[PDB]
Amino acid sequence: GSFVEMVDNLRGKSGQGYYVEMTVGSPPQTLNILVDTGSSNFAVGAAPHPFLHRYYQRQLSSTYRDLRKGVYVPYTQGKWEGELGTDLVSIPHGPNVTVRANIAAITESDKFFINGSNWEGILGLAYAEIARPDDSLEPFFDSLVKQTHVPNLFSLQLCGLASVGGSMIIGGIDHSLYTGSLWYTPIRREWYYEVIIVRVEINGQDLKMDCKEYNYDKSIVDSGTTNLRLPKKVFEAAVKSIKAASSTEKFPDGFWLGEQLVCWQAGTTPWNIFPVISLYLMGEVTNQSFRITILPQQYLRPVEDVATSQDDCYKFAISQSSTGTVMGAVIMEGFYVVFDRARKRIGFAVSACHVHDEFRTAAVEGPFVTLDMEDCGYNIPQTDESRSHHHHH
Numbered sequence: 001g002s003f004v005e006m007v008d009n010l011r012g013k014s015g016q017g018y019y020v021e022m023t024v025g026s027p028p029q030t031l032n033i034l035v036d037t038g039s040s041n042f043a044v045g046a047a048p049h050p051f052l053h054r055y056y057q058r059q060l061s062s063t064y065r066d067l068r069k070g071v072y073v074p075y076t077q078g079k080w081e082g083e084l085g086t087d088l089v090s091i092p093h094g095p096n097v098t099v100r101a102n103i104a105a106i107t108e109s110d111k112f113f114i115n116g117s118n119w120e121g122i123l124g125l126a127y128a129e130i131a132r133p134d135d136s137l138e139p140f141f142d143s144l145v146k147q148t149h150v151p152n153l154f155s156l157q158l159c160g161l162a163s164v165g166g167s168m169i170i171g172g173i174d175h176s177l178y179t180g181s182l183w184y185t186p187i188r189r190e191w192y193y194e195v196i197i198v199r200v201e202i203n204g205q206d207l208k209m210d211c212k213e214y215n216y217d218k219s220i221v222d223s224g225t226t227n228l229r230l231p232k233k234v235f236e237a238a239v240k241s242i243k244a245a246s247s248t249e250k251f252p253d254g255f256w257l258g259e260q261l262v263c264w265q266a267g268t269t270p271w272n273i274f275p276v277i278s279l280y281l282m283g284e285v286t287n288q289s290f291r292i293t294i295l296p297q298q299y300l301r302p303v304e305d306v307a308t309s310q311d312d313c314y315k316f317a318i319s320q321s322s323t324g325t326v327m328g329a330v331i332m333e334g335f336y337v338v339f340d341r342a343r344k345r346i347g348f349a350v351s352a353c354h355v356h357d358e359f360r361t362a363a364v365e366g367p368f369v370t371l372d373m374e375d376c377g378y379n380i381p382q383t384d385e386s387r388s389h390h391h392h393h
């Protein structure tokens with residue numbers, strides 16, 4: 001389990017995320033577990049399901065312990081529930097260690113497991129504050145670091161239903177996985193991997209919004225979300241600008257809504273008419289920022305259709321949010337992303353696995369200096385619910 005032993009430890013399907021192999025219990029049960037930086041629970045399918053043929057069998061693990069407490073996790077479009085416990089956990093293609101970690105055994109779920117996902121669980125890599133049922137349930141990566149000498153850092157190379165590969169390096173940075181500059185942006189608060197967007201450009205034109213609109217009500221880096229997701233005012237601005245550039249094509253509404261493909265004749269897709277998008281992230285130095293630039297190849301995603309082998313067909317992978325900006329697989333695929341928990345920051349470098357345009361490339365570039373501008377962070381109104389709960393830690 002060197003960094004060479006962790007290179008190419010991820011796999012996935014397109015638009016259904018990336019998974020890593022983990023062994024739970026003794027004797028080991030090997031399971032394919034989705035890597036999810038936008039959540040904080042380790043949870044694994046643990047009863048029969050029509051879309052699963054393997055799951056975690058608690059009864060076959062001699063080292064399993066029941067915490068005698070349930071957890072229930074509702075999402076916008078489904079849910080899971082289960083029994084908490086602890087078991088022994090290792091990553092065959094990751095560090096050479098075993099840890100005792102919390103595991104939610106998923107006993108029931110709705111619209112969580114889909115047809116041909118090929119993962120049987122979720123590895124929440126975010127921080128304790130967002131773990132269910134409360135932040136006292138220690139997340140997997142926190143247990144890894146407290147129990148071993150593994151450095152407090154991990155990095156993801158996610159390479160661009162269709163197969164996809166990648167690398168999760170645990171406790172390090174592998175220079176083979178990126179070229180050129182590694183740029184860091186501060187983690188704003190340790191809950192999600194929350195960051196601050198100071199500027200957005202579409203083919204060099206500034207959206208000119210109050211910078212707080214970009215981060216309303218947060219901006220996060222989330223490997224468990226497919227799209228780039230944008231607060232509604234920002235989404236409208238961006239689509240208006242993207243439509244302007246590509247105006248030689250008049251797409252149906254449903255395309256802009258992510259509901260419909262649009263096609264061209266095989267090999268003739270007019271990429272040059274779709275703009276690059278640059279997101280400027282707050283730099284470590286107080287005046288500075290740096291930009292990540294994504295190609296339209298990143299935000300226009302291919303689906304090989306069924307009455308269409310003659311055609312190249314695409315889905316628009318930028319969608320509206322009412323919960324902030326989410327930089328999902330659409331952003332991360334271009335990049336080597338370093339989650340530097342130890343130093344409270346997130347690095348970006350251009351990935352060595354590159355989905356590149358004939359003329360242009362996805363880029364990581366700085367610094368850019370701002371005499372002033374602003375605090376671009378948004379302060380989420382504090383509920384009485386969140387104010388009262390004690391955090392004796």
Ligand SMILES: CC1(C)Cc2cc(Cl)ccc2C(N[C@@H](Cc2cscc2Br)C(=O)O)=N1
Pocket residue numbers: 015016017018034036075077078079080110111112117223224225226227328
């Ligand atoms: C992290 C995870 C699995 C959490 C989740 C829970 C539920 Cl109930 C439904 C969809 C998702 C979900 N949706 C992704 C798409 C997706 C479905 S499976 C892996 C991925 Br990435 C998204 O909204 O972009 N992601």
Ligand SMILES: [Zn+2]
Pocket residue numbers: 021092093
């Ligand atoms: Zn293996």
Ligand SMILES: [Zn+2]
Pocket residue numbers: 390392
């Ligand atoms: Zn108290």
Ligand SMILES: [Zn+2]
Pocket residue numbers: 135136390391392393
């Ligand atoms: Zn607490």
